[PDB]
Amino acid sequence: GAPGAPGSQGAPGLQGAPGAPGSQGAPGLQGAPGAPGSQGAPGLQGAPG
Amino acid sequence: PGAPGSQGAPGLQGAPGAPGSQGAPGLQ
């Protein structure tokens, strides 16, 4: 007997390349800034006195 | 009567083997 330690099965499985990816809260496009200014009442008359 | 070497147990299996990695469709 002793069939060369009769055949044993190979190793299947491991259905994944160990990358374990996955990204958290990624970046977001900057809000094009609203240039600061000041409301006002530009008219025509400023001090007619 | 005696016959050292005559037919004993008829050969069966003798050198059994085994399939390797049968695999499995872990895909899609």
Contact state of A15 with B26 under an 8 Å Cβ cutoff:
yes
Query: Measured between CB atoms, does B24 come within 8 Å of chain A?
Result: yes
Cβ–Cβ under 8 Å, residues A2 and B16: no
To one decimal place, what's the resolution in Å? 9.8
Query: Which of B15, B21, B22 lies at the smallest CB-CB distance from A3?
Result: B15
Tell me how far apart the alpha carbons of residues A49 and A3 are, in angstroms, rounded to a whole number: 120
Nearest one of A27, A3, A23, A39 to B17, comparing CA atoms:
A3
How was this one solved? cryo-EM
Tell me how far apart the alpha carbons of residues A6 and B20 are, in angstroms, rounded to a whole number: 12
Query: Measured between CB atoms, does A12 come within 8 Å of chain B?
Result: yes
Tell me how far apart the alpha carbons of residues A39 and A42 are, in angstroms, rounded to a whole number: 9
